[PDB]
Design an enzyme around this catalytic site. Sequence first.
Site, PDB file in Angstrom:
ATOM      1  N   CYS A 291      27.174  25.862 -77.324  1.00 25.42           N
ATOM      2  CA  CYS A 291      28.460  26.361 -76.830  1.00 25.42           C
ATOM      3  C   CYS A 291      28.844  25.593 -75.696  1.00 25.42           C
ATOM      4  CB  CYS A 291      28.497  27.617 -76.231  1.00 25.42           C
ATOM      5  SG  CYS A 291      29.720  28.355 -75.163  1.00 25.42           S
ATOM      6  N   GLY A 292      30.123  24.867 -75.673  1.00 26.01           N
ATOM      7  CA  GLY A 292      30.699  23.960 -74.765  1.00 26.01           C
ATOM      8  C   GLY A 292      31.007  24.661 -73.367  1.00 26.01           C
ATOM      9  N   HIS A 293      31.110  25.892 -73.317  1.00 30.33           N
ATOM     10  CA  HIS A 293      31.322  26.607 -72.026  1.00 30.33           C
ATOM     11  C   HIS A 293      29.958  26.544 -71.481  1.00 30.33           C
ATOM     12  CE1 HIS A 293      35.003  28.010 -74.513  1.00 30.33           C
ATOM     13  NE2 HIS A 293      35.608  27.950 -73.089  1.00 30.33           N
TER      14      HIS A 293
END
Length: 115
Positions: free
Chosen positions: A30-32
């Site tokens: 997940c980029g976040h």
Amino acid sequence: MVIELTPSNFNREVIQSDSLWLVEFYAPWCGHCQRLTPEWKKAATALKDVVKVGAVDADKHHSLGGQYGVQGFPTIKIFGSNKNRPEDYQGGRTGEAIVDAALSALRQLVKDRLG
């Protein structure tokens, strides 16, 4: 500095603890979550020997992900006096904002212990 939490150590580390705990439920892909990683370390370091700061790969450990209603990532929980009822953190995702939330949670924790 950030304690890696798993189904095998979660009870001993968090549930049976009188420490205030901040826990990030994340997914590696997940980029976040990836953007949060440095800020989570920043908070953990600022809070060294004051507040315990952990992380659960809730993508891998669905058992833990399911238990705390993790439907998306990152999900951040604050484990205070009642370790069976963590609070959902919806403040800013910087170390600074997280540390401020931790201080507020500590104020609440100690005031309740005093009565």
